[PDB]
């Protein structure tokens, strides 16, 4: 009926790592290629994603146990989970009032229609937005949002993972933290853990549709040249 | 004592091609990643170069005879001449009043010190600036500037060219145009052609120092990730 000392240190270092790698001011967005509203939004959103991958890598390196994985498994885990973690962390800027991501003035407010102008279609953006409002209605604690991202990232059921048992145990140690956290520290949350595990299944199906729609981008050199070298490396097929 | 009809059509289509691919307003510079003044200038100048390569490719495709080369020789010629053509076309924005490239307000005015903040050292920027003021003092006609770029681009003495004779003949046909042009249409220019051919030799030695200083960039992934996919493709070693 009370969190372990180990379980709160896990929560601590995961919450601190999210604060180091998530800026609520979004002030760095002025450094991206400006948005334009042909694929007019693709340079700005490709910069936005590229920046976000760098933040996700910074977060991941501070999940307890992730550094001790081989560099191969680290890369395997980041390559196939990155768009899910971005979709997850992006909920901090999502808003039900506008059904958009509000990261600034009108410039860094990302409508559904802006993201279409980046080479993605409704069949991704429709489930993605729906996912965001469901996620938003869970009204998660900071400790739960942060745990969910790390549980998502530490999925052993991902292409190319070598050490299935080592990461499965890591993901299990984190799920136990989340289950205990919700039960001890979240009133009225007895049905919440199941709803977050559901959100992971939603992420796989969004990840699948994105990577398919991304392949269609990356095969047109006129569009792929608008990406960044990190994006291309993270979302392409290698070892 | 009078230009051939063939020689003026060559001049015509080369001058029109430069106007299609060179904007004197520099209005597109707002679309680059903004400059910052660690390598703070590298994102903005990497965008500037990447844009310029796209313009040089547009110019080259309209040099008479360049389209009929194999795609291999076209790529060979563009890969090893691109930074020289950029250095050549950049003279349109250079200014002796400031010894900088003035493409806008204070933002798109590129001091010598800004370019150092993009990962290049004085041993390139010192000969480069000196090259620009010498080039500027030639006070070239539009027809000569345009011819010089195409003569630079059509150099058969470049790594990987296959059809040495076909491009040598093309470069010869263009040099004859320039020699005749200067003699017929440029009063007091009887020593000018030799001075432009000298500028080509200057370009080789600047190209050599840049590609060496670029190798030192491209081997540090933290810096190379700041480049664009076109830059990386054009300045790297492939077939």
């Amino acid at each position: 009926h009370m969190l372990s000392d180990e379980q709160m240190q896990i929560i601590n270092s995961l919450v601190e790592a999210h604060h180091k790698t998530y800026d609520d001011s979004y002030s760095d967005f002025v450094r991206f290629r400006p948005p334009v509203r042909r694929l007019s939004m693709l340079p700005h959103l490709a910069d936005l994603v590229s920046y976000s991958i760098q933040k996700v890598i910074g977060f991941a390196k501070m999940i307890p146990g992730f550094r001790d994985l081989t560099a191969e498994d680290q890369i395997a885990l980041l390559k196939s989970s990155a768009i899910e973690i971005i979709m997850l962390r992006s909920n901090q800027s999502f808003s039900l009032e506008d059904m958009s991501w509000s990261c600034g003035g009108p410039d860094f407010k990302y409508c559904i229609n802006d993201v279409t102008k980046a080479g993605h279609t409704l069949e991704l953006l429709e489930p993605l937005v729906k996912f965001q409002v469901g996620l938003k209605k869970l009204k998660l604690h900071e400790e739960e949002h942060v745990l969910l991202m790390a549980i998502c990232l530490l999925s052993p059921d991902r292409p190319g993972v070598q050490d299935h048992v080592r990461i499965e145990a890591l993901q299990d140690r984190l799920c136990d933290v989340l289950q205990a956290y919700i039960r001890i520290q979240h009133p009225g949350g007895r049905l919440l853990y199941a709803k977050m595990i559901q959100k992971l299944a939603d992420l796989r199906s969004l990840n699948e549709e994105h990577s398919k729609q991304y392949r269609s981008l990356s095969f047109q050199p006129e569009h792929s040249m608008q990406l960044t070298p990190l994006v291309l490396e993270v979302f392409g097929s290698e070892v | 004592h009078m230009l051939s009809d063939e020689q003026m059509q060559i001049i015509n289509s080369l001058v029109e091609a430069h106007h299609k691919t060179y904007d004197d307003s520099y209005s597109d510079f707002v679309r680059f990643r903004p400059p910052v003044r660690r390598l703070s200038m590298l994102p903005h100048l990497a965008d500037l170069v990447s844009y310029s390569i796209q313009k040089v490719i547009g110019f080259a495709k309209m040099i008479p005879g360049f389209r009929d080369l194999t795609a291999e020789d076209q790529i060979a010629l563009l890969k090893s001449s691109a930074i020289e053509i950029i250095m050549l076309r950049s003279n349109q924005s250079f200014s002796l009043e400031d010894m900088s490239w003035s493409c806008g307000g204070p933002d798109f005015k590129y001091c010598i010190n800004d370019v150092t903040k993009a990962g290049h050292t004085l041993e390139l920027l010192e000969p480069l600036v000196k090259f620009q003021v010498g080039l500027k003092k030639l006070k070239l006609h539009e027809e000569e500037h345009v011819l010089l770029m195409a003569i630079c681009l059509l150099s058969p003495d470049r790594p990987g060219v296959q059809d040495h004779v076909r491009i040598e003949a093309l470069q010869d046909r263009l040099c004859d145009v320039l020699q005749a042009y200067i003699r017929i249409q440029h009063p007091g220019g009887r020593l000018l052609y030799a001075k432009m051919i000298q500028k080509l030799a200057d370009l080789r030695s600047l190209n050599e120092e840049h590609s060496k200083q670029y190798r030192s960039l491209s081997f540090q992934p933290e810096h190379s990730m700041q480049l664009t996919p076109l830059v990386l493709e054009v300045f790297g070693s492939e077939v």
């Binding site: 760098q54 890598i57 390196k61 680290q74 990190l230 490396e233 290698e238 070892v239 | 992934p221 990730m225």
Partner: peptide
């Protein structure tokens, strides 16, 4: 292979 990620992963 994964030049940037290896560097980013320290």
């Amino acid at each position: 292979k994964h030049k940037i990620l290896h560097r980013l992963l320290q």
